[PDB]
Amino acid sequence: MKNFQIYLSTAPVLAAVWFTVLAGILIELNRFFPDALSFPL
Amino acid sequence: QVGPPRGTMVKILRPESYWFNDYGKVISVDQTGVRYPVVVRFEKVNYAGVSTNNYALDEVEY
Amino acid sequence: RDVQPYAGLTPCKTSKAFAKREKTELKALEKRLKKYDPESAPALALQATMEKTKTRFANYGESGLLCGKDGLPHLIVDGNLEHLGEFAIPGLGFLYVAGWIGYAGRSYIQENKTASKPTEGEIIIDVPKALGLMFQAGAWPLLAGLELKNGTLTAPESEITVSPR
Amino acid sequence: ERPVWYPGKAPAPHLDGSLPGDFGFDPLSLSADPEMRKWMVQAELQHARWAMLGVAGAVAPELLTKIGVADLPNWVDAGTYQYWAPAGPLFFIQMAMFNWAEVRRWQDMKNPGSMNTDPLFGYNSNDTNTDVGYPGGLFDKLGYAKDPAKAKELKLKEIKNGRLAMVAFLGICAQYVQTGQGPVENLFSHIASPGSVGYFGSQGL
Amino acid sequence: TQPMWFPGMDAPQHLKGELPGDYGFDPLNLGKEPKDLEWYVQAELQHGRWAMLGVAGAAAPEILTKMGISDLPNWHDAPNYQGYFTDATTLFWVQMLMMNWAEVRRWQDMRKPGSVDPAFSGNKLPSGIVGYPGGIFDPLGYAKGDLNKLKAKEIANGRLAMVAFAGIMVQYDHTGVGPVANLVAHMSDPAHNNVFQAKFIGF
Ligand code: CLA
Ligand code: CLA
Ligand code: CLA
Ligand SMILES: CC(/C=C/C=C(C)/C=C/[C@@]12O[C@]1(C)C[C@@H](O)CC2(C)C)=C\C=C\C=C(C)\C=C\C=C(C)\C=C\[C@@]12O[C@]1(C)C[C@@H](O)CC2(C)C
């Protein structure tokens, strides 16, 4: 249990979770604000 | 007894040393008049994987 | 917005080649569409793609982009006020974010260096402390300025290991 | 020795019967750490109470509709009911209120004695209370916890009804998914003919 | 022991409490040594005073226009407004010339209050705590009453006005109308003129 949490806190698992979430947010931003060549003004 | 006491951190002055300009704990100093009496222990390993070696009195600073 | 021509680049909104680019892509979309009957899902998907292309081309027209002879937008990165959104503002956003990432890393490595076994915590990341330092790194530019002014950003020359030369 | 969640199986070693509704049910050992155990007892208690309130407010409007006092929609249809404010602002204020109250709850969990005095009027809930998750002085407006002998079995009753309502709410969600009406409709439909209508009765495999 | 932003926990060690506004609020530990702490106390003073002035000067044209007694422009297009005594840049350079002197003198005081008027050699500044000069800077000058109370009052009003000024800056960046216009719109339909209708029409 706690050890499993520690296992999750390992570098590979944490890298995979962090990049999964990051890719998710970036994909969602490119879905809701798509095709952004430059910052509008 | 000569040289740094045991337990003190000494700055390495040997130019070729892997831990040059780094700090290491003194483990023991040999008082039998050997050339490199100062045994210094290092947290970080060198390329050979060792964490300690011998230094002279002028190759350390504290 | 209406942008002045610069470096021999006409605005994309009033560019005939930009209109040709839009036209060509839309016609390609129509061709792709024609083989599908309107009721089927690919037909609606292609119509949505056409809509997306139209609104993209429109947004690029309005966003003050300068197009070339080829007909595609060109970025002005010399610092011009009329084209700051091309490089400066996203450049500032990147510099802020990248400095945040780096400062969170520097803070964690310096904090973990005080642990009993720093190298084990290097691979098994203390997630609560890590996240605390990550959110403290929101004010990276300030804290970096403090480190620079106090002289603790940069280690002195004597402490760093160097080659015997 | 005590009754357990599965007779003949030893209760979980990290569970020693010193908690309400302790039946040694933890095959995943999710509460082996006492610090984790405290947090998780609080999670059960909070989810229990919220699920019970959830069942009460998802059943009571439809019961009043059936009786004839007033006309109200189902628990699901209440989401799209048009109120004074849209779902945006209503939820906004709701979440502001819950950030206030749940920060007070959070710091009660961290510090039991903390969050026992009114921050705006100085009213003392309970002078130096330690039982986390059970703020009697703060919420016991009837004095139904003034005796520990009474309080422990009332705690047991709360936990049991809470777990039952958690299962009930999960059932409510699954029933609306699988049938399409409110829970109380589904109940009366099953009552009318348990051999024709119901899961595996309506041929809704 | 001071009144604290988070009553359950305890105040940070580097926040002593005597500071005029110390409510122990420093989650991201920017305080650290007292030296940059003083640089922050003065920074907070300046931001509060300038933002109080900023909120008042961004509201006052709006209040006057909406009441209809002075048809002034909105604060955001105020710079865009034409009719000033000189070109935006010309008065800007004059403005920064005028401010370079005053702000470098304040910096000298920040560095050393004692260090810092030759225009009227008789006119000096009475010695005071850093950031609160007094003397000629307070012609009203009734400090014989409570002091730390009044300083805390200034600081909290400043903190509020800065939150308000950032808020309205975001509000125009997301609505493009005056802050009081936003305010009255929220009065008219509180459930349908709030943040959810913000769209970021223009930066
Ligand atoms: C789609 C957009 C995009 C993407 C994917 C990347 C991706 C990358 N960039 Mg680039 N970049 C972009 C846009 C992009 N960039 C734009 C628009 C600018 C203009 C501001 C830059 C300017 C820039 C610089 C100057 C550098 C990068 C670097 C990098 C790499 C590491 C960045 C990082 O955060 O590491 C995590 C961050 C850290 C470990 C902290 C390190 C220090 C960071 C990079 C900057 C903070 C220092 C400070 C602000 C002073 C800057 C001085 C500078 C002006 C010379 C990575 C490959 C770096 C690199 O690979 O060079 C070797 C690098 O030095 N980028
Ligand atoms: C703690 C994070 C950190 C920081 C602050 C730096 C900072 C620096 N690096 Mg180093 N570096 C890092 C991590 C870091 N690096 C890692 C993980 C690698 C292995 C890939 C490298 C590999 C590397 C090379 C090969 C070189 C540098 C160089 C540099 C310098 C140029 C700017 C830059 O980062 O561009 C380089 C940026 C990258 C290579 C991108 C990698 C950075 C990643 C994204 C950071 C990952 C850690 C992240 C923050 C999570 C840990 C913390 C978390 C648990 C809380 C600068 C001193 C250059 C140099 O000497 O310049 C003078 C150079 O040649 N770095
Ligand atoms: C508090 C307990 C409780 C009570 C008193 C009821 C009472 C009722 N339910 Mg509800 N229900 C419950 C819990 C409960 N349910 C839970 C936890 C679920 C989620 C599985 C459901 C899902 C559900 C559906 C989808 C339906 C009912 C129906 C019914 C009615 C009886 C007819 C019938 O065949 O029921 C059978 C119901 C049960 C035996 C409920 C208990 C669920 C057990 C644990 C079965 C195992 C399910 C499991 C998750 C399957 C997946 C395995 C997979 C992981 C490999 C009656 C009103 C039916 C109805 O309303 O018809 C008018 C109907 O269609 N219930
Ligand atoms: C909080 C909760 C429900 C709250 C509901 C609310 C507020 C409902 C409100 C509403 O309806 C109303 C009032 C009126 C409507 O107008 C509006 C809404 C909003 C719709 C449910 C929790 C529901 C929680 C559930 C179902 C949790 C189930 C967990 C289980 C079975 C765990 C089992 C184990 O963990 C143990 C015990 C031991 C381990 O070792 C083994 C395993 C197996 C892992």
Side-chain angles (χ1 to χ4, degrees):
Chain A
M1 178 53 181
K2 193 62 57 180
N3 301 5
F4 176 62
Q5 312 173 203
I6 304 173
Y7 152 83
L8 304 171
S9 302
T10 56
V13 171
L14 268 187
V17 168
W18 185 251
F19 289 136
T20 294
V21 86
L22 164 67
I25 89 177
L26 287 171
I27 289 163
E28 293 286 358
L29 269 46
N30 283 113
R31 166 157 78 92
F32 285 96
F33 309 99
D35 276 8
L37 182 52
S38 59
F39 180 85
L41 182 63
Chain B
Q1 299 272 113
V2 86
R6 293 182 165 195
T8 88
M9 273 329 128
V10 287
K11 184 175 174 67
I12 306 307
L13 312 180
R14 178 185 292 182
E16 77 215 32
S17 187
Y18 174 87
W19 308 270
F20 177 58
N21 276 339
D22 273 339
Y23 288 85
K25 205 181 280 282
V26 182
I27 293 302
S28 64
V29 191
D30 289 345
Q31 310 308 311
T32 53
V34 296
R35 314 162 96 70
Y36 308 98
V38 185
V39 187
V40 185
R41 166 151 272 289
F42 295 112
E43 63 185 342
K44 58 168 51 169
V45 292
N46 65 348
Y47 301 119
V50 303
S51 275
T52 184
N53 64 323
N54 295 283
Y55 294 102
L57 296 181
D58 58 349
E59 296 189 326
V60 291
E61 187 134 36
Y62 45 95
Chain C
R1 60 198 177 94
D2 289 345
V3 299
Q4 286 279 102
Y6 184 84
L9 302 172
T10 48
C12 294
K13 181 163 54 183
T14 70
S15 163
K16 173 57 179 61
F18 198 69
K20 181 58 65 63
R21 288 285 172 176
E22 189 179 328
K23 149 195 169 302
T24 304
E25 302 187 10
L26 296 176
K27 300 171 59 180
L29 299 164
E30 302 285 9
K31 177 186 305 178
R32 278 260 302 183
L33 188 293
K34 293 179 179 179
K35 61 202 66 171
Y36 297 106
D37 49 334
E39 53 268 31
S40 147
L44 190 150
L46 270 165
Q47 288 172 345
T49 306
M50 299 214 316
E51 168 268 310
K52 173 177 166 64
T53 297
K54 269 174 288 188
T55 174
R56 175 213 310 149
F57 269 96
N59 279 315
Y60 285 179
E62 183 280 335
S63 97
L65 286 166
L66 293 177
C67 280
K69 293 179 179 179
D70 175 42
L72 325 175
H74 289 167
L75 312 193
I76 300 302
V77 310
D78 51 62
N80 196 9
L81 298 322
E82 195 64 31
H83 309 96
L84 279 188
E86 307 304 330
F87 178 71
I89 284 62
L92 276 173
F94 185 84
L95 284 188
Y96 182 67
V97 163
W100 187 327
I101 298 172
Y103 201 78
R106 182 173 164 281
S107 69
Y108 188 85
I109 216 65
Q110 290 183 350
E111 272 248 37
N112 171 80
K113 259 183 178 173
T114 52
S116 191
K117 174 52 125 72
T119 63
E120 186 75 354
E122 190 65 13
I123 50 161
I124 304 166
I125 301 84
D126 200 322
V127 182
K129 167 177 58 174
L131 281 179
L133 297 160
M134 298 211 334
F135 281 100
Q136 181 221 5
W140 84 260
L142 179 280
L143 290 174
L146 296 180
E147 294 292 328
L148 187 146
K149 189 195 64 27
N150 306 350
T152 40
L153 180 57
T154 289
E157 179 176 359
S158 285
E159 289 223 333
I160 311 171
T161 302
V162 289
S163 270
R165 291 129 183 179
Chain D
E1 201 283 14
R2 60 164 191 293
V4 288
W5 77 283
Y6 186 65
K9 183 172 287 299
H14 47 269
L15 306 177
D16 40 313
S18 64
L19 296 163
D22 188 277
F23 306 106
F25 183 42
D26 189 359
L28 271 73
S29 299
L30 306 164
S31 286
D33 191 23
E35 187 91 347
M36 184 102 267
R37 201 211 317 288
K38 294 213 247 171
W39 173 271
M40 282 293 291
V41 168
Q42 295 315 319
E44 163 133 38
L45 191 60
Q46 191 73 352
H47 271 86
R49 286 150 177 200
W50 278 116
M52 278 180 326
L53 294 178
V55 168
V59 172
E62 200 199 340
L63 285 180
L64 293 182
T65 324
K66 298 290 218 280
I67 291 296
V69 174
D71 184 13
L72 298 174
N74 297 321
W75 64 287
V76 182
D77 299 43
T80 72
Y81 194 97
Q82 213 68 20
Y83 300 99
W84 66 282
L90 291 171
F91 174 75
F92 182 108
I93 182 176
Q94 173 189 345
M95 213 78 160
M97 279 195 264
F98 272 142
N99 186 43
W100 178 266
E102 297 267 320
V103 167
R104 313 270 300 170
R105 167 59 182 278
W106 181 42
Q107 207 79 0
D108 179 30
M109 299 160 76
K110 314 217 288 145
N111 297 41
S114 75
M115 321 315 326
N116 298 356
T117 308
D118 184 328
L120 176 70
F121 288 69
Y123 278 85
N124 270 322
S125 149
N126 292 130
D127 287 310
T128 70
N129 188 13
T130 315
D131 204 349
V132 175
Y134 283 89
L138 216 176
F139 307 96
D140 269 344
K141 299 166 296 301
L142 293 183
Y144 295 0
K146 291 301 169 295
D147 298 66
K150 196 52 178 234
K152 295 292 162 286
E153 183 178 2
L154 260 296
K155 275 173 203 289
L156 178 69
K157 287 158 157 175
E158 178 180 57
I159 275 302
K160 281 143 137 43
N161 287 270
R163 292 169 182 174
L164 198 50
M166 290 190 246
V167 185
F169 173 80
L170 182 75
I172 284 170
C173 300
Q175 278 160 209
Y176 189 88
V177 166
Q178 212 270 348
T179 57
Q181 293 84 239
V184 179
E185 172 301 331
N186 292 285
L187 190 282
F188 306 147
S189 189
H190 176 71
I191 285 288
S193 177
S196 164
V197 56
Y199 203 88
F200 296 140
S202 299
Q203 320 313 330
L205 296 173
Chain E
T1 58
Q2 77 290 65
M4 163 164 200
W5 75 287
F6 211 88
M9 86 207 327
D10 53 350
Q13 315 97 24
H14 69 269
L15 301 177
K16 309 214 226 193
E18 202 184 290
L19 276 66
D22 203 330
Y23 304 110
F25 179 45
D26 193 4
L28 322 176
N29 297 92
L30 318 184
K32 295 286 136 200
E33 292 82 8
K35 295 332 305 156
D36 63 353
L37 193 289
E38 183 178 2
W39 187 268
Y40 297 156
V41 167
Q42 304 301 318
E44 191 176 11
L45 276 162
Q46 297 304 316
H47 273 71
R49 294 170 170 174
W50 275 118
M52 271 178 311
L53 296 177
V55 165
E62 209 69 16
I63 309 301
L64 291 190
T65 301
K66 298 311 167 189
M67 287 213 282
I69 61 170
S70 310
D71 302 353
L72 290 171
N74 159 242
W75 74 270
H76 185 109
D77 60 334
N80 187 200
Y81 160 90
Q82 181 179 180
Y84 293 117
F85 74 109
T86 187
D87 167 43
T89 309
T90 41
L91 51 77
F92 155 77
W93 163 242
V94 170
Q95 173 264 21
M96 294 300 293
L97 274 165
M98 260 147 60
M99 292 295 301
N100 202 60
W101 184 285
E103 291 259 353
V104 72
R105 289 201 75 106
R106 192 173 64 71
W107 196 42
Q108 189 82 336
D109 185 304
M110 295 172 63
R111 299 148 54 183
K112 171 56 59 181
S115 184
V116 294
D117 284 326
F120 296 99
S121 190
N123 176 34
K124 267 130 64 164
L125 186 71
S127 182
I129 180 140
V130 60
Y132 305 99
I136 192 163
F137 277 112
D138 55 357
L140 163 145
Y142 305 143
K144 303 175 172 181
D146 286 348
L147 181 282
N148 190 5
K149 166 175 293 182
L150 202 60
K151 283 184 181 174
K153 269 167 216 269
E154 179 180 307
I155 287 324
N157 272 256
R159 293 162 173 181
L160 203 184
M162 296 165 21
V163 177
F165 203 73
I168 74 82
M169 223 144 63
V170 179
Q171 279 169 203
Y172 189 102
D173 274 328
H174 287 74
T175 304
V177 76
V180 178
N182 275 315
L183 187 48
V184 68
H186 171 74
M187 319 281 166
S188 55
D189 192 323
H192 310 69
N193 288 123
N194 52 9
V195 63
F196 286 76
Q197 328 323 114
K199 289 186 176 185
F200 198 80
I201 61 162
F203 173 60

